[PDB]
Design a protein around this nucleic acid. Structure first.
Ligand SMILES: [Mg+2]
Ligand SMILES: [Zn+2]
Lengths: 99, 1318, 50, 83
RNA sequence: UGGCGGUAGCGU
DNA sequence: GGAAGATCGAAAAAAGCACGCTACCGCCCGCGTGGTGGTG
DNA sequence: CACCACCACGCGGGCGGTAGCGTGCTTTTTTCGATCTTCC
């Protein structure tokens, strides 16, 4: 099985799982630990944001590769936004302070 | 974009601000209309338009519901400890019996007798109403709790509670009040208010996060969130209608209780009562269920996620591949590199639009293969196996396009992947940025990884066929073809072998030239004639120039090949080592194929001497059984003898079979016979180390030996049949027991290993190297570890790749041997070992002075590269992975009277006081005396511990030979050793009241036995037994050097045989006191969790004399009285805990009072951080070495430092920290340094030891603790305390989605910090 | 999950899944059958006077 | 054409800023249209960047001063164009 | 155009 | 020299239980009342 | 054209019942009534 770009989940905005439906492999926690054990920082950010969650990042990366530029815009993962909204649905306020 | 994340409980105004509308109707979607209703859960007028690049408002716009009556938040009520109950200082039972309308609570006491917070039931309520009525206020429900919270004021309550704590003395009350004070202070320093803890406005999630997907059959999904919201809306609307109708108390009370229950179920289903059951007969998924747990958002979509540009396929051996190359299927590569192919096609102009690009791609035009070859020329791909146990689980390779559907993997990397070719699958990821390709080529490339980061051992070794091929090539017969000729060089030998004129094993003499490295660094050639074999000469052609010829002039087994590769790496470098490894693999494969080695039924030769030995063993077992029938031997000893004789028979059979196998080949030389090493394929495989060991070959050819039934015992009759022969039904059935035991063990080990690895990663994820040198002179003293007869770890292994903490003095000369701050590489280790150095002080991570990380010098070598560790290394993650990787190799199932000297050297004694007995032998009157076997070089060769009242064969400072006994003792009972010779008399233990008289079994002597204090009456327990040693003048003679006279107080159950008035010598025995862990992975888990043992060892907190007292109820009380200090110290010890120390002895700090396992917390408290670190690393290393696993102590020290991160204050000083507060040690250090700089006085602190889970949960960053586990409690505490979290970590940045400050992102984070500071 | 001695002739000591459910799932022996009460029984040949 | 970068690692000294400088150079030639300082034997931008650091033609210091050189040059060109 | 649950299997 | 403090043993409650993948099925209100349409 | 049959439907929730249901794990924290102790 192999996938470059296909359908994504409608809630977490992440690629689907399985072979019957076009889906990508899961970069689990253990793989993230292995990348952290290396000097893999840009690779990890690429795994987390530009390929899985950041829709704008995904589109920009696709366009940049199409035109021949291998540059990334990490952006903001959608999964963290979903988690923030879920936590805010309770009686708990959470926000990203700027200062 | 942002710097930190703030979490706090939400006020109703903020909740209203979030919402873009009010939800009033519980109508999600009409089935017929397909249009959401107004004011519904999916209303377009509230959450934005359904349709329009994308409608992101529906994903972010929230709603709100105005609750008719206030409802308590379940998280702040039921999550222990209860925030509302702690804040109100009221037991939780009253709290949720008032919230759910079962009892009334007073708010305003007024002039009435009842106080403010009282619980009144119905009868009490109307009794108070009739008796007083008037103006007192007693309310019911959640609004009552809200009013109670609003009425209270935090400032005066906190100040009065602090002033009470200043004048309080109760320890439990001290802890309760310090917790309450901390809670009140956290509430008052934040903008949060207690009244906000009671919900009045309910937030509503955006519809897109709880979508109603179509089922393509006319119906929809479940959407448990929508169901819970609908139930809450129904309850709220019913309550509103009831209030508008002016309902009686009972109806509104029931409706409010049901609404509160519905709100609780929506917030946390099943938290208090029974969970709401949906259409699937199972609890519905609440809001809290989608945050916590393994299936929650944190562990399923933030820490890990599915990624594009990835694929998966089975693996296949590529023998032709290079070390940096891997075979990729053409279809998989074409699918993965589609955007690159589009870009190249558009750049070269074969298509006008990208649609035309896909149209050329999927049709598979001829030029598409050329484009794909161009785009993958230098594009590394990351190959990863499913269990990523350690760092080497994912590696970068250069793709080579192949035909098929299977990924071709280089054999030499398989050991790194722990992958075998029997159905395993690997996943391939394609980096698609320049930075990622750079780190794939420079960091994750297979050529870079040559040494294991866990211990520094090489990871690329030949395993199965290369070893066999090299072993066959490098071997010699005595009469092979072409033997004795002289060859001009290796090329002539290769030509002769290929032409068939000379055999591969022919012993010839060839002229070879070898290059040696001189001082200046170049290569000098030396040509000479060497007697070798044709195969060795052929193999010499792939060896690089710098290596000598002695490496290949041998049999070249697995160990020899590994040593040759290590020498090549050490002498030549890295790239020549890679080329040499590839050539070695190629030659081994080729010559293994050419050899044609095969396994046949005749290879496993069975000797008849084995059958004779088996028959003799049967005869011996029959004789033993006949002796047992005679009744001269019991069952246990006869079973032991049977087991021993069967083991001896199995050993004899194995020895005979091995002797037959190794030298079976008796071949003829030119004149006569000669016995040489056999060429049996099984024997060659066993000897070369390619596959199999002595035990497996012995099972194949000799008897299988004894087998154990599942309970752990050994069966009397072993399996006397080989695998070549026919095992009967009994033998197979017996072997199935062990097979099933092992299979179940390896099936159930994985879950615990993974859990331990996850905990270790989470406890040490944020530790990185941030500085270069602390400048601290404090370190740890490393010495070789010896436990009675063996030196397990030499000093060289322990101190390799570690910087020194102080100037190492040369022994006996007082001259410095190494500088103070030098890294101990191989040359320094050789210098240390050649100068007879025993103990070396080296800087350690656990003593690193750098805050928020560690320094490079205090860590040491990288352990994966020759140079020192680099700044930014994620040493914590590497340490956790290194510790957790060998977890699957451990086990879980739970299954002396003299000292023997084996070496020659002097004997030294430590912390010993002793006395010469009547015979002149030394008897030790100490409890912790240690003996060391110091060799002629001064090294501590052996270490032993002697017990109380142990005789010594010879004194200190004398040389003894091996095999001699130097100390003897009786472990059955502990003796009492006297120090003064004189008449012995009895005092205060007359018979019948406190002691008893017992007749001897056969001698008939009447011996006095000290009765137990509980057993004896009150008239005897008041006094204590006293043996008094008196001189000629009449009274008790004082001990030399001590004013307190020599009277011995007999402990319980003491037995004395000699009568009073009998003269005794010094060192004699007065009384005799009767004297009475399994699993590897569980032991490691307990050690890393700091779990208190079930039978903790009692230790002396302070140094001083010991005394007894009252027996209290049924367990003894102990008093520790120091000579100079005061005597407030009393302990509470049970009878069943043995008392190692007697009544009239002197003990020091951290002395062993009761035998048993030592609690790590007590060790840390009484001996310091270094002692507990040494204990933990020793235990972990022992457990790992029991299974033959080599792990460096740096990782264990890193973990230990991570555990020790909190300290409890003792003296407040000028600091603002509370007396009972437990705060991060770095904060205390910074505050103390600032106070010392300002001239004030610091705060005394005591470091505490926490388990891995507790340490990870109790961290500054609440996000990491929430993502680890126990999300509800962590989130509740963070919201209540209003914690602000700066990421400054690996897990936090991974969850957020930014660069981790470890690798290439460390410089970026440093630049960001500098910009923020400036 | 262990192989009890009573499994002789009633439960195959080797035919069992390799994984989480090891020992919990077994295969009936060739000659094994069930009592009227549900207990497994195995055949034997009666040996009289040797 | 590249298998090991040990010499490049020792030239940079720490194996971390080597990746950063190589990525910066690769972006400079790939996006900025810069000319490589070494002949290209049909190699990618990353491999060329790694290959031209081996003999010391590219490191952080000289790259920074060279970037400053053309940024001063373009500032002066803009100033002259304005005048 | 998704989720939950159960079952069996594969690689460790 | 009898009730707070300290202990303490038992009962309850909460938290956790490796990763990746493949295939299949079963299910995704309710019910039982009443408004309203058809009807002998 | 008021009576039966079909589909909205409404609030309802644990279901079905003239009551229970539950039944092979380990560790940590709370807590709560019972017991012994000691001094104000
Ligand atoms: Mg396998
Ligand atoms: Zn340091």
């Amino acid at each position: 099985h192999a996938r470059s770009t296909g359908s994504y989940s409608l809630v977490t905005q992440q690629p689907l799982g399985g072979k019957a439906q076009f889906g990508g492999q899961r970069f689990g926690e253990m793989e993230v630990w292995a990348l952290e054990a290396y000097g893999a920082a840009y690779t990890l950010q690429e795994m987390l944001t530009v390929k899985s969650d950041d829709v704008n990042g995904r589109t920009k990366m696709y366009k940049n590769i199409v035109d021949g530029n291998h540059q990334m815009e990490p952006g903001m993962p959608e999964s963290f936004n979903v988690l923030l909204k879920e936590i805010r649905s309770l009686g708990i306020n959470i926000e990203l302070e700027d200062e | 974009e942002f710097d930190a994340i703030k979490i706090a409980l939400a006020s109703p105004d903020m909740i209203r601000s979030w919402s873009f509308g009010e939800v009033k109707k519980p109508e999600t979607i009409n089935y017929r209309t397909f249009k959401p209703e107004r004011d519904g859960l999916f209303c377009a007028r509230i959450f934005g338009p359904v349709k329009d690049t994308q409608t992101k408002v529906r994903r972010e716009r929230m709603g709100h519901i105005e609750l008719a009556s206030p409802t308590a938040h379940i998280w702040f009520l039921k999550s222990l400890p209860s925030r509302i109950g702690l804040l109100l200082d009221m037991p939780l039972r009253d709290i949720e019996r008032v919230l759910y309308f079962e009892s009334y609570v007073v708010i305003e006491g007024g002039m009435t007798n009842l106080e403010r917070q009282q619980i009144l039931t119905e009868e009490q309520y109307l009794d108070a109403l009739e008796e007083f009525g008037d103006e007192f206020d007693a309310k019911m429900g959640a609004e009552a709790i809200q009013a109670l919270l609003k009425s209270m004021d935090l400032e005066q309550e906190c100040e009065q509670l602090r002033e009470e704590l200043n004048e309080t003395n109760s320890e439990t009350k001290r802890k309760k009040l310090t917790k309450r004070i901390k809670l009140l202070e956290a509430f008052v320093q934040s903008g949060n208010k207690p009244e906000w803890m009671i919900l009045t406005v309910l937030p509503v999630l955006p519809p897109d996060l709880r979508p109603l997907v179509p089922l393509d059959g006319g119906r929809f999904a479940t959407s448990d969130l929508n169901d819970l919201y609908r139930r809450v809306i129904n309850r709220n609307n019913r309550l509103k209608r009831l209030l508008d109708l002016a309902a009686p108390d009972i109806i509104v009370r029931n409706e409010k209780r049901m609404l509160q229950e519905a709100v609780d179920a929506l917030l946390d289903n099943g938290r208090r009562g029974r969970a709401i059951t949906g259409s699937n007969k199972r609890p519905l998924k609440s809001l809290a269920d989608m945050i916590k747990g393994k299936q929650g958002r944190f562990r399923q979509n933030l820490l890990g996620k599915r990624v594009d540009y990835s694929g998966r396929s089975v693996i296949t051996v590529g023998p032709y591949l290079r070390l940096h190359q891997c075979g990729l299927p053409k279809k998989m590569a074409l699918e993965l590199f589609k955007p690159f192919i589009y870009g190249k096609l558009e750049l070269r102009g074969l298509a006008t639009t990208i649609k035309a690009a896909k149209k050329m791609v999927e049709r598979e035009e001829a030029v598409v293969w050329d484009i794909l070859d161009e785009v993958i020329r230098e594009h590394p791909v990351l190959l990863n196996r499913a269990p990523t146990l350690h760092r080497l689980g994912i590696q970068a390779f250069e793709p080579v396009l192949i035909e098929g559907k299977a990924i071709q993997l280089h054999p030499l990397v398989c050991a790194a992947y722990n992958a075998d070719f029997d159905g395993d699958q690997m996943a391939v990821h394609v980096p698609l940025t320049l930075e990622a390709q750079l780190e794939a080529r420079a960091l994750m490339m297979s050529t870079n990884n040559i040494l294991s980061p866990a211990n520094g051992e090489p990871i690329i070794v030949p395993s199965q066929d290369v070893v066999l091929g090299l072993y066959y090539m490098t071997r010699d017969c005595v009469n092979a073809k072409g033997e004795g000729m002289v060859l001009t060089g290796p090329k002539e030998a290769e030509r002769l072998y290929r032409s068939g004129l000379a055999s591969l094993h022919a012993r010839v003499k060839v002229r070879i030239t070898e290059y040696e490295k001189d001082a200046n660094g170049e290569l000098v050639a030396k040509t000479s004639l060497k007697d070798t074999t044709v195969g060795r000469a052929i193999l010499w052609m792939i060896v690089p120039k710098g290596l000598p010829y002695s490496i290949v002039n041998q049999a070249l087994g697995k160990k020899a090949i590994s040593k040759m590769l290590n020498t090549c790496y050490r002498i030549l470098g890295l790239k020549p080592t890679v080329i040499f490894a590839d050539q070695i693999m190629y030659t081994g494969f080729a010559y293994a194929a050419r050899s044609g080695a095969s396994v046949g039924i005749d290879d496993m030769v069975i000797p008849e001497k084995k059958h004779e030995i088996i028959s003799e063993a049967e005869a011996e077992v029959a004789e033993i059984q006949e002796q047992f029938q005679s009744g001269l031997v019991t069952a246990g000893e006869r079973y032991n003898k049977v087991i021993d004789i069967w083991a001896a028979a199995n050993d004899r059979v194995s020895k005979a079979m091995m002797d037959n196998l190794q030298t079976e080949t008796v071949i003829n030389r030119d004149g006569q016979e000669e016995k040489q090493v056999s060429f049996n394929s099984i024997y060659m495989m066993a000897d070369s180390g390619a596959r199999g060991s002595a035990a497996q070959i012995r099972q194949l050819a000799g008897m299988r030996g004894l087998m154990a039934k599942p309970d752990g015992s050994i069966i009397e009759t072993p399996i006397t049949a080989n695998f070549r022969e026919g095992l009967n039904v009994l033998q197979y059935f017996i072997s199935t027991h062990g097979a099933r035991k092992g299979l179940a063990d390896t099936a159930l080990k994985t879950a615990n290993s993974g859990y331990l690895t996850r905990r270790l990663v989470d406890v040490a994820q944020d530790l990185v190297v941030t500085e270069d040198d602390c400048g601290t002179h404090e370190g740890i003293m490393m010495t070789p570890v010896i436990e009675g007869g063996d030196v397990k770890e030499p000093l060289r292994d322990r101190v390799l790749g570690r910087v020194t903490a102080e100037d190492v003095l040369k022994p006996g000369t007082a001259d410095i041997l190494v500088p103070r701050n030098t890294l101990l590489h191989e040359q320094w280790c050789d210098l240390l070992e050649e100068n007879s150095v025993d103990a070396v002080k080296v800087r350690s991570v656990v003593s690193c002075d750098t805050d928020f990380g560690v320094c490079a010098h205090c860590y040491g070598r990288d352990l994966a590269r020759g140079h020192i560790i680099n700044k930014g290394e994620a040493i914590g993650v590497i340490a956790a992975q290194s510790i957790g990787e060998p977890g699957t190799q451990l086990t879980m199932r739970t299954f002396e009277s003299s000292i023997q000297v084996k070496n020659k050297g002097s004997i030294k004694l430590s912390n010993v006081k002793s006395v010469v007995n009547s015979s002149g032998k030394l008897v030790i009157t100490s409890r912790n005396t240690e003996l060391k076997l110091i060799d002629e070089f001064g090294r501590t060769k052996e270490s032993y511990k002697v017990p109380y009242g142990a005789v010594l064969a010879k004194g200190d400072g004398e040389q003894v030979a091996g095999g001699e006994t130097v100390a003897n003792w009786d472990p059955h009972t502990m003796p009492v050793i006297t120090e003064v010779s004189g008449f012995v008399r009895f005092t205060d233990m007359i018979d019948g009241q406190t002691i008893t008289r017992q007749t001897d079994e056969l001698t008939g002597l009447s011996s006095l036995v000290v009765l137990d204090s509980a057993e004896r009456t009150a008239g005897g327990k008041d006094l204590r037994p006293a043996l008094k040693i008196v001189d000629a003048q009449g009274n008790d003679v004082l001990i030399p050097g001590t004013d307190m006279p020599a009277q011995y107080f007999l402990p319980g159950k003491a037995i004395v045989q000699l009568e009073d008035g009998v003269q005794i010598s010094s060192g004699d025995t007065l009384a005799r006191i009767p004297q009475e862990i399994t699993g590897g992975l569980p032991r490691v888990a307990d050690l890393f969790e700091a779990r208190r043992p079930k039978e903790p060892a009692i230790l002396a907190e302070i140094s001083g004399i010991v005394s007894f007292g009252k027996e209290t109820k049924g367990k003894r009380r102990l008093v520790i009285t120091p000579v100079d200090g005061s005597d407030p110290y009393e302990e509470m010890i049970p009878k069943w805990r043995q008392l190692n120390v007697f009544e009239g002895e002197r003990v020091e700090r951290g002395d062993v009072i009761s035998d048993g396992p030592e609690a790590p917390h007590d060790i840390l408290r009484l001996r310091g951080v270094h002692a507990v670190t040494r204990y933990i690393v020793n235990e972990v290393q022992d457990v790992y070495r029991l299974q033959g696993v080599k792990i460096n102590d740096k990782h264990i020290e890193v973990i230990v430092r991570q555990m020790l991160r909190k300290a409890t204050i003792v003296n407040a000083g000028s600091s603002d920290f509370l007396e009972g507060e437990q705060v991060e040690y770095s904060r205390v250090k910074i505050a103390n340094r600032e106070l010392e700089a300002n001239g004030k006085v610091g705060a005394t602190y005591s470091r505490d030891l926490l388990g891995i889970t507790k340490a990870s949960l109790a961290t500054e960053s609440f996000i990491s603790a929430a993502s680890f586990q126990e999300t509800t409690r962590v989130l509740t505490e963070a919201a209540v305390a209003g914690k602000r979290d700066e990421l400054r970590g690996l897990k936090e940045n991974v969850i957020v989605g930014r660069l981790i400050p470890a690798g290439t992102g460390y410089a970026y984070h440093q630049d960001r910090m500098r910009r923020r500071a400036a | 999950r262990d192989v009890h001695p009573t499994h002789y002739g009633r439960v195959c000591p080797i035919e069992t899944p390799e994984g989480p459910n090891i020992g919990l799932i077994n295969s009936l022996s060739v000659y094994a059958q069930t009592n009227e009460y549900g207990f497994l029984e195995t055949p034997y040949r009666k040996v009289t006077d040797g | 054409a590249r298998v090991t970068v040990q010499d490049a690692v020792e030239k940079i000294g720490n194996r971390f800023d080597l990746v950063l400088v190589a990525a910066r150079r690769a972006r400079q030639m790939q996006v900025g249209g810069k000319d490589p300082l070494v002949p290209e034997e049909n190699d990618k931008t990353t491999v060329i960047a790694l290959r031209e650091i081996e003999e010391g033609l590219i490191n952080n210091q000289i790259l920074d001063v060279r970037e400053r050189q053309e940024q001063q040059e373009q500032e002066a060109a803009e100033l002259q164009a304005v005048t």
